[PDB]
Symmetry: D2
């Protein structure tokens, strides 16, 4: 809760080369994510009664926040949560394909990893403008693939995020320019499915 | 949970005369509310995995429901929950002014009952078209007065409803015609604040 | 343009009996439409620069209007325009089935009056809450059947309304109560297709 | 009308250096604008009846277009129109401050170029995610500063665009990365106010 902090990236900026360039990792983490944390803290600073609330809870209750900070919390709180998840999902050294319980749910519900990749790729490519593509779980045990605009996080709608892929141009412009599809092909090489499994089990 | 049932009104249709006419109470309960229950059950019938979920939960997770029934659940599930609360709030024999813990929160936050009545009246009069005016509580202990369109219930946004006033024309047309303001003046005579207090304490 | 006028019905309030009751015709014209005109004028009084503009123009450029009157113009301006068309469409003595050029357009695009009646009935039945069902024409010569919420008029989206059916509860509650279907069945006996032809030809 | 054409920039890709880099100008025109034109044409190929319509007309009547192409036209049609205006506004060799009738309008409504630059900068800075900041004219002779999301163009709401500033990340990421503010500071050196005057006069 408040004051929110920029999480450690956790590995060297060049750990994901040649899939994601080092310069992007640094700017994405230090500048983009760093700015969302600053702005989120700046919004919440004037309302002490919201100081002990986790960001997930603020996002599930946007409509209850003072009107003058709802957009700032949505954008920046969503930006903080989304990127926090993203850095963990990109941790080197994990399974490159779904494993464990998440694997069984994916096989059962989508027919297997190949079918999921295709659906997640379609949702990411179809997100016009800035956004994120997601694999989420609902309270009823079903998995869904969807995309959200800008920094909106699926917890706003009651879902629990499992995998998120950043499709803002800043996530891929330096190395791939307009070629979002090439960026998506490369992301599969660095996703950590042991981390996705933890997210899946935890909720 | 499924199959949902029309709740007993709980008192004679004429119990609220001369404030709300008996004919409206009967049609509002049997026909309007009866239709929302039927339609909600018809939507959920084809999805057994949703059969043990309370209506409040379905409404908090609309985005997760099969696409072909999201609107039907929103409209009819919202219609069922809204009117269920309304019949209880209109139970004869209760306090005519806020009492207990809800009274302390209202005095503290709005300055007293008179200030609340004025705010709730403004929200009800300002709801253009069909809708409901509400006094709700959020998870952070604050009260809000707002209105929602059609049969939307504030649980969709994370709030807990305390008092709801139906402003669909069917709620007042037979006796008051276009005079929504006269209907609102009369509603204060039949609200049960002991029931509002229970809602307030319970969440 | 400003100050707008409530148009005369042009026929006695009892002229559509037993299809639509006289008391509703009177209240619907004098109280509902009368209030929309009055409120539209009150909104526009403060901005002399908008006094020479027809309501249709104001509605097509809502986004340009001063922020404090946008909703008032949308709601009361739409209320004014929708009801003015409606009174003309209910004028006694006209053709009871489509005639002329509109007939030709209906037979080519929908397949016949029977097919159009079914689509329009579905559209009126499917409008949850307050709204209007419409037969409209676009600039490319296509006819569409759609519904709009509250007092929104299809001119806001670039369509030209030909037939509009009021499905707010005040339009039918006194005589039909919850039975919107019985009300739509009755409307077919009173719609004036020579007026609809006029609207279609000036389209 | 159809088939739409990618317009030539009309100047070398390096003409705006060091304000906007040549590599961005090239990719922005050939790859981004080129794809919007290509995709717009692909959407329209299936509906011969829409082939004689200018893109502005298609955008003002999106609601009338077949459902399967509405988004494609909105996004790629808006992309086409926004970028075509943008290349013209960046034409080298024009006035660096407002001139002529637009100047008069700016001085009367905003108080001067300095006041307009501040409003437009705020509007560009405040557009979260992808979008465009605009100076637009309405039918009543008022100038407005607003922003739009993604490739939405103000013509959809009845405005005539005069100045449009692209704030999608692809417009500035190669040279400025996260520093949108530095990019806006640079744009003032390259905007052609004689072209803006032309747009304002044909308004
Ligand atoms: Mn990012
Ligand atoms: Mn009701
Ligand atoms: Mn009406
Ligand atoms: Mn661009």
């Amino acid at each position: 809760p408040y004051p929110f902090k920029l999480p450690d990236l956790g590995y060297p900026y060049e750990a994901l080369e040649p899939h994601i360039d080092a310069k992007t990792m640094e700017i994405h983490h230090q500048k983009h994510h760093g700015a969302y944390v600053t702005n989120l803290n700046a919004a919440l600073e004037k309302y002490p009664y919201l100081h002990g609330v986790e960001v997930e809870v603020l996002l599930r209750h946007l409509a209850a926040l003072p009107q003058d900070i709802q957009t700032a919390v949505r954008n920046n709180g969503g930006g903080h949560l989304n990127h926090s998840l993203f850095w963990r999902l990109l941790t080197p050294g994990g399974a490159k394909e779904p494993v464990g319980e998440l694997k069984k749910a994916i096989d059962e519900q989508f027919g297997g990893f190949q079918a999921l990749k295709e659906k997640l790729t379609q949702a990411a490519m179809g997100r016009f403008g800035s956004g994120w593509a997601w694999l989420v779980k609902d309270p009823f045990g079903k998995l869904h693939v969807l995309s959200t605009p800008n920094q909106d996080n699926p917890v706003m709608e009651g879902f629990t995020p499992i995998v998120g892929i950043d499709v803002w141009e800043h996530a891929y412009y330096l190395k791939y320019q307009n070629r979002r599809a090439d960026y998506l092909q490369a992301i599969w090489n660095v996703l950590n499915w042991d981390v996705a499994e933890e997210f899946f089990k935890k909720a």
